Design a protein around this ligand. Structure first.
Ligand code: LL1
Lengths: 20, 338
């Protein structure tokens, strides 16, 4: 499921802004 | 229209402060430092108590030398200049700012309930009505901000604090900018970036409306529409033209989203000739009472637990670290206007 793919991904914690 | 008239008055109010910003309205020694609520590559945010009033604040501390290394000087001046000048119920309140030899400080009123991000991740996803309550507040806020020629550029649940009445305060203005034309800086957060930002075109406030679609999707789904383990893979997804909705999304929700997450600017909601009204008048929003939302008269889906004044249990724990203030002024000319 997409939910399972999300939870197993490295992007479920707070996400940093980017720039440059 | 009374909205126009509201917004005209709002603009007079803002321009007076924009053009004559408050400077140097407290000193670090007036505050008792309690606990770190967050850290980042150029500073940190701490809970503090203002001794003279006993009020609690979140004080953002920015190391000037780190701001300069990261090329964030203009962005940091934007942040303080805009924040001191705006006034809207869904915006964090900047009560004081000042600077010393080492650091810049922005002291905001403390929102103890924490970030939407925490409560969303823990609970998993919000019901459509719960999402819509939050989305309404962002809709009003952006209408306010954009009318003032301001682009916010970092919409995400991480920046949306939940107050004691369960209403939002937007924080983290470090990418907000007052711009009448188009602009070009690559900034924001990967999952929230509009296609035109990724593709290095000039862009405008429509990027905030694309980010709204990302937010509503993530609130109602529990995960963003475009995710992968690496930012480059997220960017390919965003530009691709393709979004899938959970089967639980109402068909109206899906139609808002297809219009908000529109790769094509002449088609993007919030960016058309009727502007924000395309969004406020959408069917997904037909039960929203815009004035009662503004007045905070609608009952919230959720009120954070409050143990008392000064509680930090809605924020994560961070290693504490001395605040050392140099005996020498750093970067004085860079931050002269702060
Ligand atoms: C990291 C942690 C907390 C905050 C806040 C904050 C939290 C509570 N009250 C006002 C601002 N703004 N920006 C942040 C970044």
């Amino acid at each position: 499921t997409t939910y399972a793919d999300f939870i197993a991904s490295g992007r479920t914690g707070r996400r940093n802004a980017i720039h440059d | 229209e009374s909205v126009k008239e509201f917004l005209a008055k709002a603009k007079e109010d803002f321009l007076k402060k924009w053009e004559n910003p408050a400077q140097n309205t407290a000193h670090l020694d007036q505050f008792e430092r309690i606990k770190t609520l967050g850290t980042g590559s150029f500073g940190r945010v701490m809970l503090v108590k203002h001794m003279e009033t006993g009020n609690h604040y979140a004080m953002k501390i920015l190391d000037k030398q780190k701001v300069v290394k990261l090329k964030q000087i203009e962005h940091t001046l934007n942040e303080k200049r805009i924040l001191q000048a705006v006034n809207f119920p869904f915006l964090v309140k900047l009560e004081f700012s000042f600077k010393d030899n080492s650091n810049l400080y922005m002291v905001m009123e403390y929102v103890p309930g924490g970030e939407m991000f925490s409560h969303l991740r823990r609970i998993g996803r919000f019901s459509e009505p719960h999402a819509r309550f939050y989305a309404a507040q962002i809709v009003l806020t952006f209408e306010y901000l954009h009318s003032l020629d301001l682009i916010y550029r970092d919409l995400k649940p991480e920046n949306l604090l939940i107050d004691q009445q369960g209403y939002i305060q937007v924080t983290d203005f470090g990418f907000a900018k007052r711009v009448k034309g188009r602009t070009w800086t690559l900034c924001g957060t990967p999952e929230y970036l509009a296609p035109e930002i990724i593709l290095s075109k000039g862009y405008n406030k429509a990027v905030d409306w694309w980010a709204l679609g990302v937010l509503i999707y993530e609130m109602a789904a529990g995960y963003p529409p475009f995710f992968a383990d690496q930012p480059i893979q997220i960017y390919e997804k965003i530009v691709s033209g393709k979004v899938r909705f959970p089967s639980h999304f109402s068909s109206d929700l899906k139609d808002l989203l297809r219009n908000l997450l529109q790769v094509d600017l002449t088609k993007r909601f919030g960016n058309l000739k009727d502007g924000v009204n395309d969004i406020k008048n959408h069917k997904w929003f037909a039960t929203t009472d815009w004035i009662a939302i503004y007045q905070r008269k609608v009952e919230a889906p959720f009120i954070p637990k409050f143990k008392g004044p000064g509680d930090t249990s809605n924020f994560d724990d961070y290693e504490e670290e001395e605040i050392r203030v140099s005996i020498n002024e750093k970067c004085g000319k860079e931050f002269s206007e702060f």
